[PDB]
Amino acid sequence: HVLKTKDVDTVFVERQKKVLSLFQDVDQLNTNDEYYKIGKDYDIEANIDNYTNKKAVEDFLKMYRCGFLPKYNEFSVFHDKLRDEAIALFHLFYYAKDFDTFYKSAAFARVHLNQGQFLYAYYIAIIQRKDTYGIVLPAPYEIYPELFVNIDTTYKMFRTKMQNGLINPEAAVEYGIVKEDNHYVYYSNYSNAITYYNEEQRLAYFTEDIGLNAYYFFFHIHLPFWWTAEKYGNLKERRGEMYHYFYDQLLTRYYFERLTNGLGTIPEFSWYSPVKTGHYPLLTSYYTPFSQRPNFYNVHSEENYEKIRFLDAYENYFVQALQKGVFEGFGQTIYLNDSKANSFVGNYWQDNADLYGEEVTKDYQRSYEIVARQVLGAAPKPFDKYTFMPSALDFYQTSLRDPTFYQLYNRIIGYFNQFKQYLEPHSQEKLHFVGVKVNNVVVDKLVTFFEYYDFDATNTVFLTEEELKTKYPHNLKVRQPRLNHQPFNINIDIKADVATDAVVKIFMGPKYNENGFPITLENDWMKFFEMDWFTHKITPGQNTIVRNSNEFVIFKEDSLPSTELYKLLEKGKVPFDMSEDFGYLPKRLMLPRGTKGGFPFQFVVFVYPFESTTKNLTPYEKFMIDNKPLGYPFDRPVDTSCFKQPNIFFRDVSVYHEGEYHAYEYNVPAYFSH
Amino acid sequence: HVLKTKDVDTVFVERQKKVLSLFQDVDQLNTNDEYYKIGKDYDIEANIDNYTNKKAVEDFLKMYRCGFLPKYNEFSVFHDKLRDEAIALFHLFYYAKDFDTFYKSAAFARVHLNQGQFLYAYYIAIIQRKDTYGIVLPAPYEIYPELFVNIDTTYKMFRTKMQNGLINPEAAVEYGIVKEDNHYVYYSNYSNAITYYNEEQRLAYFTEDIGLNAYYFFFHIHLPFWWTAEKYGNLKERRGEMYHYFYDQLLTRYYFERLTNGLGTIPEFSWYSPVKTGHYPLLTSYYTPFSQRPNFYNVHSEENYEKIRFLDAYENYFVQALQKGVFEGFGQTIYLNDSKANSFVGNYWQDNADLYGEEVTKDYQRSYEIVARQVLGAAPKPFDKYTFMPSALDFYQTSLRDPTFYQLYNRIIGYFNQFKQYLEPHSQEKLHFVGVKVNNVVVDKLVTFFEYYDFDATNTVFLTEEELKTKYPHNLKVRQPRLNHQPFNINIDIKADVATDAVVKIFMGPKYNENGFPITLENDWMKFFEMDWFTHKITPGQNTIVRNSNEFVIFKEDSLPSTELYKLLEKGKVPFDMSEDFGYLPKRLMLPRGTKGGFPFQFVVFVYPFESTTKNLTPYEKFMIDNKPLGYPFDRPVDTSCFKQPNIFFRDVSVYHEGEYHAYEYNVPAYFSH
Ligand SMILES: *[C@@H]1O[C@H](CO)[C@@H](O[C@@H]2O[C@H](CO)[C@@H](O[C@@H]3O[C@H](CO[C@H]4O[C@H](CO[C@H]5O[C@H](CO)[C@@H](O)[C@H](O)[C@@H]5O[C@H]5O[C@H](CO)[C@@H](O)[C@H](O)[C@@H]5O)[C@@H](O)[C@H](O[C@H]5O[C@H](CO)[C@@H](O)[C@H](O)[C@@H]5O[C@H]5O[C@H](CO)[C@@H](O)[C@H](O)[C@@H]5O)[C@@H]4O)[C@@H](O)[C@H](O[C@H]4O[C@H](CO)[C@@H](O)[C@H](O)[C@@H]4O[C@H]4O[C@H](CO)[C@@H](O)[C@H](O)[C@@H]4O[C@H]4O[C@H](CO)[C@@H](O)[C@H](O[C@H]5O[C@H](CO)[C@@H](O)[C@H](O)[C@H]5O)[C@@H]4O)[C@@H]3O)[C@H](O)[C@H]2NC(C)=O)[C@H](O)[C@H]1NC(C)=O
Ligand SMILES: *[C@@H]1O[C@H](CO)[C@@H](O[C@@H]2O[C@H](CO)[C@@H](O[C@@H]3O[C@H](CO[C@H]4O[C@H](CO[C@H]5O[C@H](CO)[C@@H](O)[C@H](O)[C@@H]5O[C@H]5O[C@H](CO)[C@@H](O)[C@H](O)[C@@H]5O)[C@@H](O)[C@H](O[C@H]5O[C@H](CO)[C@@H](O)[C@H](O)[C@@H]5O[C@H]5O[C@H](CO)[C@@H](O)[C@H](O)[C@@H]5O)[C@@H]4O)[C@@H](O)[C@H](O[C@H]4O[C@H](CO)[C@@H](O)[C@H](O)[C@@H]4O[C@H]4O[C@H](CO)[C@@H](O)[C@H](O)[C@@H]4O[C@H]4O[C@H](CO)[C@@H](O)[C@H](O[C@H]5O[C@H](CO)[C@@H](O)[C@H](O)[C@H]5O)[C@@H]4O)[C@@H]3O)[C@H](O)[C@H]2NC(C)=O)[C@H](O)[C@H]1NC(C)=O
Ligand SMILES: *[C@@H]1O[C@H](CO)[C@@H](O[C@@H]2O[C@H](CO)[C@@H](O)[C@H](O)[C@H]2NC(C)=O)[C@H](O)[C@H]1NC(C)=O
Ligand SMILES: *[C@@H]1O[C@H](CO)[C@@H](O[C@@H]2O[C@H](CO)[C@@H](O)[C@H](O)[C@H]2NC(C)=O)[C@H](O)[C@H]1NC(C)=O
């Protein structure tokens, strides 16, 4: 298994090394590094001519002269002041006329501003600026290790750095601390191996997977809710569509993990009753432990009355719009069948900039999601604008760790899916592919297993004045057994009459509902996980297609550590996926953990005529190369019919799991010491 | 597989035919039957000299002159008036000087009294009277089909009888109605195939198994809570022990079923909060449907205020007694270490006759169990002393159907197990068998599966005047897939120093807790299901014991329908087990349904010195042939020690399940019509 690579020129390489020079030892400043001198004395005012937008720069300066979030404090985009500052900073980065002015602005920020705040605006700018297109971003877990690993292993790294090494390596092994080469390796367990407060803990290997969490972070920085989608041209008109697709797909995938663990559907809650599923983040900031929400949390308390009424009102509005058939307000009146209605509900639920026709949201345009994250996070109200007790719900990099995150968005998609039943359902004729028929589909054995995975966590530690004189160590390694599966083929048999360009899609869906009974397309159309999308020229007669799971376009390879990125740069290359598909879900997670006896699911292949791609979303996500609605044909209900189309095939499938069932078993000292 | 038989003489054979003559078409009277003429004119008063207790007879006559529960009304021993009348009836039967007087009294009852009331006292008298010892009892599901099969199938039988056969056999098949020979067979689903109101429904194949339920009914009539245990001699002093053992074992067996179904530990509840798991009995009486308790039932309502205070007080008394190290009241002072302590707590929790040192319980001796069943049953207060809306908790034959049954007794055994930690824990020395060592234990593959089981359900129907002139039809058969498992051997390897008489016990226990983590003997000693108990002579050197599951003494063969009993009688024979082990749990249920991949458990063999059997309980249950406390050595905690005793062995074991996972699949017309 070789990783696909891509060729880059000398300019790109030079810009790549520059951006990476600002992603090192992020919680500390190195006066020996070139960036410190540049950044410390950069005069934004004096170079105001090197920015395409003078107003944005002046607003930044005006804001900056008043002070920004101090260093070391936690930064969260869900807090007004912090967000506005971060956004002003983003504008300073985005409007730099050229890479050089941008780099200097970045260095300025790195030296003067809050590390978290800088990293946030930095990450987004690299994604948004045209001149940095293709630039490979370092893994978020490598940049925010304190957000991707529990305190028990963070504390072990702290103890190692404080002791300046291992004092008794033979004893350290019993605490998962091993030395390999010149690296210190830390075997890190998911939380279900240290605390089991509720049954949802059984899903910890999935909800705490660094790749899954990185995936949500990438989703957000690819296109922040506070920013307009203008830059992406077409996506703007299809933004709400993308919202639905992303969350439906994520919720459905999470649902599958629940199913193979016997946890049933995503729980429903009320803002007027205790929230059943609590959550205890084993994370910490530099000033406080993350807030905890005990099981059966009394959410309807005096501190949340007003917020709950707002959330209620927000839901009420939508439900009433569905009833009367029209969305009023926001400067327009949309009937449910309007051609922009789909984008409206999506933008409405997310309360994004595009809902208002602006480039950035304002503080007074209150958000359902932000307020809901606030009350579900269970944190006491902020001490002040710059100080708050964070919860898993305050970061896109830790959101998926909280069971209520899925419950919140499942509630939202719940309404979105209700809205979809008011639309014209897909007719049997529009779904039919005259001349095309799928005679059979055979799927190879589906097997999951846990496999060790390492990543650089050195950013967890603080370097010595002497250590800063020499090259960075990239000394610490965090090792966790992560979910994965064996590659598998899908053999498709297609009997055709005429020759035509066809599109073939591969989905994965449940076979039974939570109670073990047969699924129903009428109520379960939204439970199909899109796995593949590709064009294929169908020749008259017999057509045999073989798609290997490693080829599914929906997923990407694991990221490589910054150190391997450099070696690859010497060759004038960059990982293909890491550069162009950084937002895709890691392929090692395309399958939910199976069971020893094999858990029931079904694959489905659908092939339809290839045609218009005039309003595709390639500038956003590469695989979106058609005009059909995202998730087609499971994007909305379908005109109930008891006789399936010949161009769609459903194949039963079983997901088995090999090796140790529980991930923590691979971190038992007796085991890894062999 | 041949069923063990037993030889019986002419006297026995004649009495067996007499007792069975009163178990036919029980809801109807046959004036053509000999018993009718006998019973209709039998004069109890005139024969008073034929009973060994004249007071008992006069009390029955005095009571009977005021009236008894009318025919067709539902009978339940949990209602005062009904119980008192039944007990008087039981005394009339128990004190008959000889079988003939007994028979005539019974015939009198069958003609004049409420069917259910009669069957109840009849069943018990047959078990208690010395001259009827060994008499075979008909299966309870054959006598009370309307309490062992849901109404959907009962209504089908009614339809068949009203039509006097099938009007369209070909159509009837699609509804589970089939004709085989001269029988009408009805495929009957467990409730989870028709309504899935909560996750507990997943357990319906077990909680509704007719054998499991019959088992509870037999436990009761064997020795009612309202009767003293005097007749059984030693049982009286060890009654409490027997109470703990019966329920703990049953709760543990049920816990195993939850485990392989991902349902965790037995839920805990509060009398002051909504009861989470509801229950919908798909049963009916002749006047009303059974009462239903919806999920999240508001149990703390004005109707239950006083009852709940009584229940709370009952529990407080016990908790405080434990805290102060002594039980006070009920005519004595018992410190926790008193030899009479164990029986006191069991008799206290059951509020039985022996708690008071009386023959039978009185109306004012309020029962925790009866009141708890009253409020958990959720039925509205009784219309009057003879009329009430029944719940599954009003019958020993339907109790195991209701999830709260296990929650109630789990709560009670929880208190019993807390009491046991105040006693002297078995020391390692007493557990040690000097010179005996179990080197190894090997268990054959553990495999479960569903298999069709039939029983006579003709009592569900009413016969015609003409049909009554001829022999009873035994026309209707109920067919259901019931749990079962393949036979398996356990090879025990023992290394002895000298020769001795040893006792060997076999238990099945969980391997992991509900969260999937290792079990702990300090906290899970009460979770070991006793499977076998037998004496074996040990010779010096190497010993090898091979026990087949069909040999385990704790279980019994399934019961035979009454028609088969007659045929066997012609040869002067009766089924061995049905005769003297009717109270045992059906062996086809000794193993919980497994999983396709195999669910983890562990078998443990323990061998100790065979000695004293002075206070054994053979008169009650055959297998209780020792002096040791029931469930030894897991009858109480053990002096925690990380080093295993040589004479005890634990072996990991996996229970797989073959064929269809869901029982209802075997009742699908397309399936059984082949
Ligand atoms: C415990 O607990 C407690 C309780 O809580 C606490 O306390 C707290 O504390 C805190 C802290 O400390 C505080 O705060 C702080 O304060 C301070 C002071 O204040 C004041 O003052 C100021 C100043 O003044 C001045 O200036 C101005 C302008 O701007 C003017 O106007 C005036 O006049 C003056 O003048 C002067 O100036 C100068 C001096 O400085 C010179 O030039 C001369 O001298 C002249 O003359 C000011 O500004 C203020 O103001 C305010 O206030 C007032 C009243 O009072 C008013 O009127 C105003 O308006 C204002 O106010 C307000 O407004 C509003 C309201 O309505 C709001 O917003 C608020 O409130 C405000 O405030 C006063 O007066 C100060 O300074 C500081 O600041 C800082 O921080 C912040 C945040 O926090 C920011 O924003 C800013 O920007 C700053 O920053 C900085 O720092 C930090 C730390 O802290 C950091 O992180 C950052 O980064 C930065 O850094 C920088 O700086 C520093 C110093 O400062 C240095 O050091 C550094 O350096 C480094 O680094 C670099 C890089 O970057 C390198 O290169 C090097 O090398 C190294 O070295 C840098 O440079 C703050 O704010 C408070 O207050 C308290 N609270 C209370 C209640 O009290 C404590 O802390 C604790 N403790 C423990 C231990 O934990
Ligand atoms: C709708 O809804 C409504 C509402 O809920 C309902 O109503 C109800 O109904 C019911 C039912 O019907 C009712 O009840 C009833 O009533 C009746 C009447 O009463 C009256 O009367 C009586 C009687 O008297 C007499 O006797 C005595 C003695 O014992 C004396 O003393 C007197 O004087 C008299 O004498 C006379 O008469 C006689 C006749 O009888 C003769 O001998 C001569 O003539 C002389 O002179 C009485 O007892 C009563 O009393 C009472 O009351 C009073 C008041 O008024 C008082 O004072 C008293 O004390 C008494 O008691 C009381 O007490 C207490 C109080 O505190 C309480 O506990 C209560 O209250 C009581 O009451 C009167 O006066 C009656 O009779 C009836 O009875 C019956 O039943 C029961 C149960 O229920 C029982 O227990 C009994 O025993 C009886 O039984 C019977 O019947 C049944 C049915 O019913 C059955 O099941 C059984 O088994 C039995 O049977 C028998 O008999 C019959 C008749 O009756 C016949 O028929 C039969 O036949 C058969 O048999 C065999 C088989 O087994 C064969 O063999 C043959 O063939 C066949 O036929 C048998 O025999 C009851 O009780 C009520 O009341 C009502 N309620 C109201 C509010 O009103 C309705 O019903 C509905 N409907 C629908 C449709 O659903
Ligand atoms: C009054 O409200 C209107 C609309 O609600 C505001 O107009 C918007 O202004 C923003 C500039 O911040 C534009 O980006 C939008 O396109 C405008 N939308 C509409 C519908 O006009 C207007 O700014 C408000 N009045 C004032 C004085 O600000
Ligand atoms: C008052 O109550 C006491 C206690 O319940 C009764 O005493 C019992 O009497 C019976 C005689 O039938 C004895 O067998 C018991 O051993 C006694 N128990 C105790 C604790 O003493 C007493 O009989 C009752 N008195 C009356 C007049 O009914």
Coordinates of all heavy atoms in Angstrom, one line a residue, chain A residues 29 36 40 64-71 111-113 287 383 385-386, ligand 1:
Chain A
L29 N 7.3 30.9 22.2 CA 7.9 31.8 21.2 C 9.4 31.5 21.2 O 10.0 31.3 22.2 CB 7.7 33.3 21.6 CG 6.4 33.9 21.3 CD1 6.6 35.5 21.5 CD2 6.0 33.6 19.9
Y36 N 10.4 35.4 14.6 CA 10.3 36.3 15.8 C 10.7 37.7 15.5 O 10.1 38.7 15.9 CB 11.1 35.7 16.9 CG 11.0 36.5 18.2 CD1 10.0 36.1 19.2 CD2 11.8 37.6 18.5 CE1 9.9 36.9 20.3 CE2 11.7 38.3 19.6 CZ 10.7 38.0 20.6 OH 10.6 38.7 21.7
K40 N 7.9 40.5 15.4 CA 8.0 41.5 16.5 C 8.0 43.0 16.1 O 7.4 43.8 16.7 CB 9.3 41.2 17.3 CG 9.5 42.2 18.4 CD 10.7 41.9 19.3 CE 10.8 42.8 20.5 NZ 9.6 42.9 21.3
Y64 N -7.2 46.1 17.6 CA -6.0 45.7 18.2 C -5.5 46.7 19.2 O -4.9 46.3 20.2 CB -4.9 45.4 17.2 CG -3.6 45.0 17.7 CD1 -3.4 43.7 18.3 CD2 -2.5 45.9 17.7 CE1 -2.2 43.4 18.9 CE2 -1.3 45.5 18.2 CZ -1.1 44.3 18.8 OH 0.1 43.9 19.3
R65 N -5.7 48.0 19.0 CA -5.2 49.0 19.9 C -6.0 49.0 21.2 O -5.5 49.5 22.2 CB -5.4 50.4 19.2 CG -4.3 50.6 18.2 CD -4.9 51.6 17.1 NE -3.9 51.7 16.0 CZ -4.1 52.3 14.8 NH1 -5.4 52.7 14.6 NH2 -3.2 52.4 13.9
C66 N -7.1 48.3 21.2 CA -7.9 48.1 22.3 C -7.6 46.9 23.1 O -8.1 46.7 24.3 CB -9.4 48.1 22.0 SG -10.0 49.8 21.8
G67 N -6.8 46.0 22.6 CA -6.4 44.8 23.2 C -7.1 43.6 22.7 O -8.3 43.7 22.2
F68 N -6.4 42.5 22.7 CA -7.0 41.2 22.3 C -6.9 40.2 23.4 O -6.3 40.5 24.5 CB -6.2 40.7 21.0 CG -6.8 41.1 19.7 CD1 -7.2 42.3 19.5 CD2 -6.8 40.1 18.7 CE1 -7.7 42.7 18.2 CE2 -7.2 40.5 17.4 CZ -7.7 41.8 17.1
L69 N -7.4 39.0 23.2 CA -7.4 37.9 24.2 C -5.9 37.7 24.6 O -5.1 37.6 23.7 CB -8.0 36.6 23.6 CG -7.9 35.3 24.3 CD1 -8.7 35.3 25.6 CD2 -8.3 34.2 23.3
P70 N -5.6 37.6 25.9 CA -4.2 37.5 26.3 C -3.7 36.1 26.0 O -4.5 35.1 25.7 CB -4.3 37.7 27.8 CG -5.6 37.2 28.2 CD -6.5 37.7 27.0
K71 N -2.4 35.9 26.0 CA -1.8 34.6 25.7 C -2.1 33.6 26.8 O -2.3 34.0 28.0 CB -0.3 34.8 25.6 CG 0.1 35.4 24.3 CD 1.7 35.6 24.1 CE 2.1 36.1 22.7 NZ 2.2 34.9 21.8
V111 N 3.7 36.2 17.2 CA 4.4 36.9 18.2 C 3.6 37.7 19.2 O 3.8 37.6 20.4 CB 5.5 37.8 17.6 CG1 6.2 38.6 18.8 CG2 6.6 37.0 16.9
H112 N 2.6 38.4 18.7 CA 1.8 39.2 19.5 C 0.4 38.7 20.1 O 0.0 39.2 21.2 CB 1.5 40.5 18.8 CG 2.7 41.3 18.4 ND1 3.4 42.1 19.3 CD2 3.4 41.4 17.2 CE1 4.4 42.6 18.7 NE2 4.4 42.3 17.5
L113 N -0.2 37.8 19.4 CA -1.5 37.3 19.9 C -1.6 36.0 20.6 O -0.6 35.2 20.7 CB -2.5 37.3 18.7 CG -2.4 38.6 17.9 CD1 -3.4 38.6 16.7 CD2 -2.8 39.8 18.8
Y287 N -6.0 27.1 32.6 CA -6.6 27.7 33.8 C -7.7 27.0 34.4 O -8.0 27.3 35.6 CB -7.1 29.1 33.4 CG -6.0 30.1 33.1 CD1 -5.5 30.3 31.8 CD2 -5.3 30.8 34.1 CE1 -4.5 31.2 31.5 CE2 -4.3 31.7 33.9 CZ -3.9 31.9 32.6 OH -2.8 32.7 32.3
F383 N -16.7 34.0 33.1 CA -16.2 34.9 34.1 C -16.3 36.3 33.5 O -16.8 37.3 34.1 CB -14.8 34.6 34.6 CG -14.3 35.5 35.6 CD1 -14.7 35.5 36.9 CD2 -13.2 36.3 35.3 CE1 -14.2 36.3 37.8 CE2 -12.7 37.2 36.2 CZ -13.2 37.2 37.5
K385 N -15.5 38.4 29.2 CA -15.3 38.1 27.8 C -14.1 37.3 27.4 O -14.1 36.7 26.3 CB -15.3 39.5 27.0 CG -14.2 40.4 27.3 CD -14.1 41.5 26.4 CE -12.9 42.4 26.6 NZ -12.6 43.3 25.5
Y386 N -13.1 37.3 28.2 CA -11.9 36.6 27.9 C -11.6 35.3 28.7 O -10.7 34.6 28.4 CB -10.7 37.5 28.1 CG -10.5 38.6 27.0 CD1 -9.9 39.8 27.3 CD2 -10.9 38.4 25.7 CE1 -9.6 40.8 26.3 CE2 -10.6 39.3 24.7 CZ -10.0 40.5 25.0 OH -9.7 41.4 24.0
Ligands
LIG1 C1 -5.7 37.2 40.1 O1 -7.1 37.6 39.9 C2 -7.2 39.0 39.6 C3 -8.7 39.3 39.5 O2 -9.2 38.9 38.2 C4 -6.4 39.3 38.3 O3 -6.5 40.7 38.1 C5 -6.6 41.1 36.8 O4 -5.3 41.0 36.2 C6 -5.4 41.4 34.8 C7 -4.0 41.0 34.2 O5 -2.9 41.5 34.9 C8 -5.7 42.9 34.6 O6 -5.7 43.3 33.3 C9 -4.6 43.9 32.7 O7 -4.6 45.3 33.1 C10 -3.4 46.0 32.7 C11 -3.5 47.4 33.2 O8 -4.7 48.0 32.8 C12 -4.7 49.4 32.8 O9 -3.6 50.0 32.1 C13 -3.7 49.8 30.6 C14 -2.5 50.5 30.0 O10 -2.6 51.9 30.2 C15 -1.7 52.6 29.4 O11 -1.9 52.5 28.0 C16 -3.2 53.0 27.5 C17 -3.2 52.8 26.0 O12 -3.5 51.4 25.7 C18 -3.3 54.5 27.9 O13 -4.7 54.9 27.5 C19 -3.1 54.7 29.4 O14 -3.1 56.1 29.7 C20 -1.8 54.1 29.8 O15 -0.7 54.9 29.2 C21 0.6 54.3 29.3 O16 0.8 53.2 28.4 C22 2.1 52.6 28.4 C23 2.2 51.7 29.7 O17 1.5 50.5 29.5 C24 3.2 53.6 28.2 O18 3.3 54.0 26.8 C25 3.1 54.9 29.1 O19 3.4 54.6 30.4 C26 1.6 55.4 29.0 O20 1.5 56.5 29.8 C27 -5.0 50.4 30.1 O21 -5.2 50.1 28.7 C28 -6.2 49.8 30.9 O22 -7.4 50.4 30.4 C29 -8.6 49.8 30.8 O23 -9.0 50.1 32.1 C30 -9.4 51.5 32.3 C31 -10.0 51.7 33.7 O24 -9.1 51.1 34.6 C32 -10.4 52.0 31.2 O25 -10.6 53.4 31.2 C33 -10.0 51.6 29.8 O26 -10.9 51.9 28.8 C34 -9.8 50.0 29.8 O27 -10.9 49.5 30.4 C35 -11.7 48.5 29.9 O28 -12.6 48.8 28.9 C36 -13.7 47.9 28.8 C37 -14.6 48.2 30.0 O29 -15.7 49.0 29.6 C38 -13.2 46.4 28.8 O30 -12.8 46.0 27.5 C39 -12.1 46.1 29.8 O31 -12.6 46.2 31.1 C40 -11.0 47.2 29.6 O32 -9.9 47.0 30.6 C41 -6.0 50.0 32.4 O33 -6.0 51.4 32.7 C42 -3.3 45.9 31.1 O34 -2.1 46.5 30.7 C43 -3.4 44.5 30.7 O35 -3.4 44.4 29.2 C44 -2.9 43.2 28.6 O36 -3.9 42.2 28.7 C45 -5.1 42.4 27.9 C46 -6.0 41.2 28.1 O37 -6.1 40.9 29.5 C47 -4.8 42.7 26.5 O38 -6.0 43.0 25.8 C48 -3.8 43.8 26.4 O39 -3.4 44.0 25.0 C49 -2.5 43.5 27.2 O40 -1.9 42.4 26.6 C50 -0.5 42.2 26.9 O41 -0.3 41.5 28.2 C51 -0.9 40.1 28.2 C52 -0.5 39.6 29.6 O42 -1.4 40.2 30.6 C53 -0.2 39.3 27.1 O43 -0.7 38.0 27.1 C54 -0.4 40.0 25.7 O44 0.1 39.3 24.7 C55 0.1 41.4 25.8 O45 1.6 41.3 26.0 C56 2.3 42.5 25.8 O46 2.2 43.4 26.9 C57 2.8 42.9 28.1 C58 2.6 43.9 29.2 O47 1.3 44.5 29.2 C59 4.3 42.5 27.9 O48 4.8 41.9 29.1 C60 4.4 41.6 26.7 O49 5.8 41.4 26.4 C61 6.2 40.1 26.2 O50 5.7 39.5 25.0 C62 6.2 40.1 23.8 C63 5.6 39.3 22.6 O51 4.2 39.7 22.6 C64 7.7 39.9 23.7 O52 8.3 40.6 22.6 C65 8.4 40.6 25.0 O53 9.8 40.4 25.0 C66 7.7 40.0 26.3 O54 8.2 40.6 27.4 C67 3.7 42.2 25.5 O55 4.4 43.4 25.1 C68 -4.6 43.7 31.2 O56 -5.8 44.3 30.7 C69 -7.1 43.1 35.3 O57 -7.3 44.5 35.2 C70 -7.2 42.6 36.7 N1 -8.5 42.6 37.1 C71 -8.9 43.3 38.2 C72 -10.4 43.2 38.6 O58 -8.1 43.9 38.9 C73 -5.0 38.9 38.5 O59 -4.3 39.1 37.3 C74 -4.8 37.5 38.9 N2 -3.5 37.2 39.3 C75 -2.9 36.0 39.0 C76 -1.5 35.8 39.4 O60 -3.6 35.1 38.5

